[PDB]
Design an enzyme around this catalytic site. Structure first.
Site, mmCIF file in Angstrom:
data_model
loop_
_atom_site.group_PDB
_atom_site.id
_atom_site.type_symbol
_atom_site.label_atom_id
_atom_site.label_comp_id
_atom_site.label_asym_id
_atom_site.label_seq_id
_atom_site.Cartn_x
_atom_site.Cartn_y
_atom_site.Cartn_z
ATOM 1 N N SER A 35 16.242 32.955 5.112
ATOM 2 C CA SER A 35 17.610 32.731 5.568
ATOM 3 C C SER A 35 18.165 33.996 6.216
ATOM 4 O O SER A 35 17.958 35.111 5.727
ATOM 5 C CB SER A 35 18.511 32.295 4.405
ATOM 6 O OG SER A 35 18.575 30.879 4.295
ATOM 7 N N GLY A 36 18.865 33.816 7.335
ATOM 8 C CA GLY A 36 19.427 34.920 8.080
ATOM 9 C C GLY A 36 18.497 35.539 9.100
ATOM 10 O O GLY A 36 18.970 36.209 10.028
ATOM 11 N N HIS A 94 25.727 31.515 4.390
ATOM 12 C CA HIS A 94 25.514 31.285 2.958
ATOM 13 C C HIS A 94 24.808 32.438 2.253
ATOM 14 O O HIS A 94 24.844 32.499 1.019
ATOM 15 C CB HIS A 94 24.721 29.989 2.714
ATOM 16 C CG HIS A 94 23.267 30.072 3.078
ATOM 17 N ND1 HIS A 94 22.765 29.572 4.262
ATOM 18 C CD2 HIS A 94 22.203 30.561 2.398
ATOM 19 C CE1 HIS A 94 21.459 29.769 4.304
ATOM 20 N NE2 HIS A 94 21.093 30.369 3.186
ATOM 21 N N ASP A 153 26.482 27.993 10.079
ATOM 22 C CA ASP A 153 25.845 28.857 9.093
ATOM 23 C C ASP A 153 25.627 30.245 9.679
ATOM 24 O O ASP A 153 24.511 30.772 9.645
ATOM 25 C CB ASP A 153 24.525 28.242 8.632
ATOM 26 C CG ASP A 153 24.118 28.696 7.241
ATOM 27 O OD1 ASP A 153 24.919 29.388 6.577
ATOM 28 O OD2 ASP A 153 22.994 28.359 6.808
#
Lengths: 223, 218, 99
Positions: free
Chosen positions: B173-174, B41, B88
């Protein structure tokens, strides 16, 4: 305004442009001059401060024909229900009387619940968006046809024909859109309706506030 | 990272910063000299041609000579579901090949399918917000965390700072989740807000995609 | 220094014909929780949708439209937030739908 043409400049001197300051943002609406010191509009165009712009055509320029007046009072209708959009009408008490010229003057309001028979061809004008991606810097207009109340009783769960009008033929792609709220619905040069809401696709029919069905409260408030 | 500590400078050389107009917005993991592994995402709604992969930084706010910067050339997905936050994971091919050194190294991924049971000690990291309503990180943050299975589904790796309000925040995120020396998770989402102390944070389970990742980087 | 991102709210199947826009700062990365508190904001200011109405709604979601043509659909009754940041200057518009 979806599916209309551009207005002949200042041929509609009653039109009002509303710069509304809300919490966490701005909002832009329409409206119309009903007396030298009052603009009628919709009640969900209400905010804390309201810059009213009369006698304009291109609002993203500043014309000497324009007149910038902040609103002294924005009086929503006491039965205005934002959840259902009911009694969607509001009076703006301007802080000063207008110059009144051939570009700025009020519009005639109807007689206490005047009718409006289905099929009647009316005109709605405003500075709203013309599609879901494009807008306009100049005032536009379109001609719409009143429908039978059944067309709006089907589509909208809170359509009340005692206090609202059903406008827009299902089959033609004309309607008022985002930014035309508060603008007048005009038949025989009389402000019979106020732009309120429709489906978000812009597909007609759509709902106007029935101006005629609110006349006693207007004159009482206009003091 | 909320409730963490400043990380030893370049103690995690595989740590990657993704930046849009000089601003950090997601972490990533260097898995090969021309491939970073991040959350799906982070790149699903962004101008990929403006993203700049920044390797071996530490203080994002100041000029660092150890830095190397790349653009994204190709994108590799494996069935990401933005409605349910499933798979994800994304792999970005770089417009070049990084020079491995003390500040920039390739990370180690687990064996395919190796699942971490409850109680395992891990380490979350990233330049995410230091606190909900407090602001983005300027120095890489790390945080001892514990793997949990309760309040979790099999599709994710869930962690929980136990007994405190601390965890990942936005901009994490990531970023990788390091357990026993391996990238077991890519940070995906939180519940209720940052560092709720009630709901575990959620990582994409890297160990379920090792086979798919190997076929990409070869 | 700041920008205006337009939004539209349709509750119960009707959307007001107002041109409404939120206030964000120019070129700033924010989280999907920052956006949620502003959506739940104009949801109350425009059409009287409170936190209780959301919980009891049939469904409640909003959709960030980005200027590159892509969008991201957020479930307001989910309470889940991807831990990413998005840049305010990349957002085309927001749409909100509640039942």
């Amino acid at each position: 305004i979806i599916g209309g043409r551009e207005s002949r400049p200042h041929s509609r001197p009653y039109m009002a442009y509303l710069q509304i300051q809300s919490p966490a943002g701005q909002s832009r609406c329409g409206g119309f001059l009903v007396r030298e010191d009052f603009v009628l509009t919709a009640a969900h165009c209400w905010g804390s401060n309201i810059n009213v712009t009369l006698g304009a055509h291109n609002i993203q320029r500043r014309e000497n024909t324009q007149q910038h007046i902040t609103a002294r009072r924005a009086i929503r209708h006491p039965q205005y229900n934002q959840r259902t959009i009911q009694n969607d009408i509001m009076l703006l008490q301007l802080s000063r009387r207008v110059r009144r010229n051939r570009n700025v003057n009020p519009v005639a309001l109807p007689r206490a619940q005047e009718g409006l028979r289905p099929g009647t061809l009316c005109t709605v004008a405003g500075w709203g968006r013309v599609s879901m991606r494009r807008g306009t810097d100049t005032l536009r207009e379109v001609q719409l046809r009143v429908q039978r109340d059944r067309q709006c009783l089907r589509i909208f769960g809170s359509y009340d024909p005692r206090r609202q009008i059903c406008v827009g033929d299902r089959r033609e792609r004309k309607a008022a859109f985002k930014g035309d709220s508060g603008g007048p619905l005009l038949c025989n040069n009389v402000a019979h309706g106020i732009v309120s809401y429709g489906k978000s696709s812009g597909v007609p029919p759509e709902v106007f506030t029935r101006v005629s069905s609110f006349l006693p409260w207007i004159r009482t408030t206009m003091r | 990272i909320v409730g963490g500590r400043r990380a030893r400078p370049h103690a995690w050389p595989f740590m990657v910063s993704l930046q849009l107009r000089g601003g950090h917005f997601c972490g990533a993991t260097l898995i090969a000299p021309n491939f970073v592994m991040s959350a799906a995402h982070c790149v699903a709604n962004v101008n990929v041609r403006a993203v700049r992969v920044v390797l071996g930084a530490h203080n994002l706010s100041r000029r660092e000579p150890t830095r190397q910067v790349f653009a994204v050339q190709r994108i590799f997905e494996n069935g990401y579901d933005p409605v349910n936050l499933l798979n994800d994971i994304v792999i970005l091919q770089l417009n070049g090949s990084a020079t491995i050194n003390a500040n920039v190294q390739v990370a180690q991924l687990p064996a395919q399918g190796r699942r971490l049971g409850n109680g395992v000690q891990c380490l979350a990291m990233g330049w995410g917000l230091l606190g909900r309503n407090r602001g983005i990180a300027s120095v890489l943050q790390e945080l001892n965390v514990t793997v949990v299975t309760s309040l979790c589904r099999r599709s994710n790796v869930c962690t929980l700072v136990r007994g405190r309000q601390a965890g990942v925040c936005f901009g994490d995120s990531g970023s990788p989740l390091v357990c026993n020396g391996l990238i077991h998770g890519i940070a995906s989402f939180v519940r209720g807000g940052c560092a709720s102390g009630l709901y575990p944070d959620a990582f994409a389970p890297v160990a379920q995609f090792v086979n798919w990742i190997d076929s990409i980087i070869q | 220094s700041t920008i205006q991102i337009p939004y539209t709210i349709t509750v119960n199947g009707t959307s007001q014909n107002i041109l409404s826009s939120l206030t964000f700062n120019k070129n700033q990365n924010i989280s999907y929780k920052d956006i949620e508190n502003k959506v739940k904001s104009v949801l109350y200011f425009n059409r009287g949708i409170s936190d209780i109405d959301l919980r009891l709604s049939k469904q409640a979601e909003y959709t960030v439209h980005f200027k590159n043509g892509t969008k991201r659909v957020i479930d307001l009754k989910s309470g889940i937030y991807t831990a990413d940041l998005i840049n305010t200057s990349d957002i085309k518009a927001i749409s909100v739908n509640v039942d």
